[PDB]
């Protein structure tokens, strides 16, 4: 039901690494940063939510949808490091809508085995 701990990019150092050296694709809804770790056997997801969405509830909600959207995809996705920045126009998406969006970027940055 939930994304495993090991599949989560926790601390800032890891993020900065992806930002500075990773690759990027952007949507009207999200900015997906994917670094690359050949030394990682499983993928990692980091979440950055605009914060220009104030309601912790809208932010926590959107995070869950992306995390859960990833769970549905953990198998078809390369084992890299991902950072998804949720843009303002993502705040009101439904799971289905979020998943279609993430797969736009995933198909863009060819992160599909
Ligand atoms: Zn550098
Ligand atoms: Zn590394």
Check the chain for breaks (C–N over 2.5 Å) and list the residue before each, or none. Answer: none
Ligand nearest to the CA of 17: 1
Three-state secondary-structure class, residue 92? coil
Question: How far does the centroid of ligand 1 lie from the alpha carbon of residue 17, in Å?
Answer: 8
Counting the structural domains of the chain, the total is 1
Question: How far does the centroid of ligand 1 lie from the alpha carbon of residue 62, in Å?
Answer: 30
Give the C-alpha separation, 65 to 12, whole Å. Answer: 22
Ligand nearest to the CA of 44: 2
Cα angle, residue 9 at apex, residues 39 and 51 outer, rounded to 5°: 150
Q: Domain range for residue 6?
A: 1-113
Structural contact between residues 46 and 15, judged by C-beta atoms closer than 8 angstroms: yes
Structural contact between residues 46 and 82, judged by C-beta atoms closer than 8 angstroms: yes
Q: Give me the CATH number covering residue 50.
A: 3.30.230.10
Rounded to an integer, what is the distance from CA 1 to the centroid of its chain?
17
Question: How far does the centroid of ligand 1 lie from the alpha carbon of residue 11, in Å?
Answer: 17
- DSSP state letters, 33-54: EE---TT-SS-EEEEEE-STT-
What is the DSSP secondary structure assignment for residue 76, as one 8-state letter?
A: T
Stated in angstroms to one decimal place, the resolution of this structure is 2.6
What lies within 8 Å, CB to CB, of 69 at 6+ separation is 95, 98, 99, 102
Give the C-alpha separation, 39 to 18, whole Å. Answer: 15
**Where do the H-state alpha helices sit in the chain?**
12-21, 56-73, 95-108
């Amino acid at each position: 039901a939930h994304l495993k701990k090991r599949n989560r990019l926790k601390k800032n150092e890891d993020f900065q690494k992806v930002f500075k050296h990773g690759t990027s694709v952007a949507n009207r809804q999200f900015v997906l940063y994917t670094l690359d770790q050949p030394e990682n056997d499983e993928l990692r997801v980091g979440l950055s939510v605009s914060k220009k969405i104030g309601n912790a509830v809208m932010r926590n909600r959107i995070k869950r949808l992306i995390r859960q959207a990833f769970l549905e995809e953990k198998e078809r996705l390369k084992e890299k490091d991902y950072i998804i920045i949720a843009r303002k126009p993502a705040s009101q998406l439904t799971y289905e809508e979020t998943k279609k969006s993430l797969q736009h970027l995933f198909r863009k940055s060819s992160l599909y085995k």
